[PDB]
Amino acid sequence: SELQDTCTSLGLMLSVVLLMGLARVVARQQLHRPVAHAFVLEFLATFQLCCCTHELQLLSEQHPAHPTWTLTLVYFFSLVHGLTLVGTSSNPCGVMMQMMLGGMSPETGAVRLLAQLVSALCSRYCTSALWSLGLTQYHVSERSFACKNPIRVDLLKAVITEAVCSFLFHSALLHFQEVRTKLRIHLLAALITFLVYAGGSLTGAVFNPALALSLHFMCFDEAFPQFFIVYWLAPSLGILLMILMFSFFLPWLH
Amino acid sequence: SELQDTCTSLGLMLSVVLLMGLARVVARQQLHRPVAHAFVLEFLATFQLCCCTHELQLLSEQHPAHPTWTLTLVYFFSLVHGLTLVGTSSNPCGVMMQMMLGGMSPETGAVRLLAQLVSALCSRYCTSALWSLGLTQYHVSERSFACKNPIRVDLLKAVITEAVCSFLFHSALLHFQEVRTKLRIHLLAALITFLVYAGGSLTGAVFNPALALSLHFMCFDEAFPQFFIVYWLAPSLGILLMILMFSFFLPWLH
Amino acid sequence: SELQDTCTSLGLMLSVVLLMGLARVVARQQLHRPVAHAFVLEFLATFQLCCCTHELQLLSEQHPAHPTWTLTLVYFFSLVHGLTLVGTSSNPCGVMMQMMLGGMSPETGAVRLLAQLVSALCSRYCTSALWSLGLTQYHVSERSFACKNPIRVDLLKAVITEAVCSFLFHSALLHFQEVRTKLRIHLLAALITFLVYAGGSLTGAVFNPALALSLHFMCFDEAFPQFFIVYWLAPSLGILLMILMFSFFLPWLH
Ligand SMILES: CCCCCCCCCC
Ligand SMILES: CCCCCCCCCC
Ligand SMILES: CCCCCCCCCC
DSSP states (O other): OHHHHHHHHHHHHHHHHHHHHHHHHHHHHHOOOHHHHHHHHHHHHHHHHHHHHHHHHHHHHHOTTOHHHHHHHHHHHHHHHHHHSTTOOOOHHHHHHHHHSSOOOHHHHHHHHHHHHHHHHHHHHHHHHTTSSSOSTTTTTGGGGOOOOSOOSOHHHHHHHHHHHHHHHHHHHHHTSSSOHHHHHHHHHHHHHHHHHHHTTTTOOOOOHHHHHHHTHHHHHHSHHHHHIIIIIHHHHHHHHHHIIIIIIHHHHO | OHHHHHHHHHHHHHHHHHHHHHHHHHHHHHOOOHHHHHHHHHHHHHHHHHHHHHHHHHHHHHOTTOHHHHHHHHHHHHHHHHHHSTTOOOOHHHHHHHHHSSOOOHHHHHHHHHHHHHHHHHHHHHHHHTTSSSOSTTTTTGGGGOOOOSOOSOHHHHHHHHHHHHHHHHHHHHHTSSSOHHHHHHHHHHHHHHHHHHHTTTTOOOOOHHHHHHHTHHHHHHSHHHHHIIIIIHHHHHHHHHHIIIIIIHHHHO | OHHHHHHHHHHHHHHHHHHHHHHHHHHHHHOOOHHHHHHHHHHHHHHHHHHHHHHHHHHHHHOTTOHHHHHHHHHHHHHHHHHHSTTOOOOHHHHHHHHHSSOOOHHHHHHHHHHHHHHHHHHHHHHHHTTSSSOSTTTTTGGGGOOOOSOOSOHHHHHHHHHHHHHHHHHHHHHTSSSOHHHHHHHHHHHHHHHHHHHTTTTOOOOOHHHHHHHTHHHHHHSHHHHHIIIIIHHHHHHHHHHIIIIIIHHHHO
């Protein structure tokens, strides 16, 4: 059973990576509107990131005796996302950073933000639509779209965790811009793995409002402000701390 | 209580970073003597590193159920030190490396070493002077300036830990000189976090004679040679191993 | 006893690094045949990597209460191998990568593969020949050349672990080619440490057919196909996945 349970989980994620890769190839051959192409690529990139993260989290909770096993898979798939999702953010907090600490206009930023939000809801539905066709034994429940409360620490602790992780990732994302592309993807994948390892036991270390929407949508519906604070406000506060540090403090300090 | 306990701890460290940042700005505007400016900046940089590390260690022991939570804060503040303390070492072992494996003259090296030692004692006093004004509930004890014996492993194990960590950090510090500044700070912050994670449970992973003086001054007074060996001799032995490896062995090997 | 037990373990590894360093220097002064020089250097590099890994694993199992202590030593010696074993692979899977995803001819690749295999068997014999002269208390058993079954996870889990680790390391090895040499060695040492930390509790995280031959030769003899699948097939499958990803998928995707 576990032989079929594990193979199906990896197979679906590799299927999704190939399926969104083909969709990117197809879109790149019949989408000559720059705004429309920006929307579709962001929709595909967010869908891949959400579905793979959904499967990775489900794999982890089915394998509690080997926490280090999923850590390598988290690194592997973070590296895969970097190599295949070039030119996208798949993160609303990343879009605010490029609009504020960068040259991204609000016109293209609004389209990317919308594409991420539609993809996050679509990824959850496809996540719920999948796992209902049979396949894995644990997929039969399909999580029953039941809130699991990813955050167990206090409200203040979770906000600090998400703000610091958002600050740590996006500052590196901003500071690795001039770095060689191949090296940068490996560095960001390593940083993502550390943040997940550091924050996964406390908050889940999402620092991604769109990804948190797909993972914990039913948690959001039950208690909106508490989840909206931890996963939408706190990561956005890490981006604001980058503005204060890298636009006001450091330029004046040096 | 824990909501006020945690907020005060972060608030003080961010206060110190801003307060030493302003002092650096003020010093940079009224200190035209190059030797005097070198002393003050090293005093401010060592004070910030000692006070933040004091608060981080105190936060960690108050939060034993979430060891990964402090790990992100350790990374965050290591990154902050790299961004704000440019041009300083805040490490006596780093000064020996620049005097020996570098062009730093003993004239400027002696001033930096003194500034670190005055700052380490001043940081401890300000650490003891603080926490006595009330503020946090656990601050009321203010650690009671009581030896906590940071090293529990055998004497040989702790010496190896401090020598290897000093070798690992300072070799990277030497080898990341040509690396882009923004990338280098992120890499050294990650390395610091690993060494603290790897060595914190055994020695504390200081590899910094000045920082160890502030953290464990009362431990030093009770048993000097044992702490002087682990925290002053062993880190200095890691620098010597770098001289043997990178000046004698490797040049002859290649 | 443990003071002598630990000092002997570090002393032998540093002795081997110096002894293979001198042999490399001697070979570089009396070997004018390029094929012969390629064989000897690969034999010396594989011997150093196998013997140090043998001692590191033996140190780790003698020190179960301080798992983080050996992690720093694993990083330290991985960094040492990078600095002293320049121009070699010490990995059969690395040789396939250079023959397939690179310009290494099969003529020089076959000599390197043979040199690794002779060294792995010679390292095991010298490992068994050593520890029989007395020295450490735990060396007296000298592991009794008894199978320890490094893999406890299921067959499917171990194959995934070795394939992913081989993919993760060798893709970074391929993508760090243009990176500065000094930075690259530090990055690969960090990646090796993570893979060992991530995979050591499940498989041992070898992703090195030659190294696995020396470590678990008696395990190989007892149950060949099961160990040949995990340590020879699975790492070679990670290299094949790199070919599919970096020669077929990514070029067509972008
Ligand atoms: C602790 C989990 C994350 C560790 C990542 C280390 C990667 C090294 C640089 C590629
Ligand atoms: C920025 C490179 C990745 C950071 C990983 C640091 C891990 C340290 C704690 C294990
Ligand atoms: C030099 C970059 C930081 C090194 C971190 C390695 C962590 C490996 C064990 C988790």
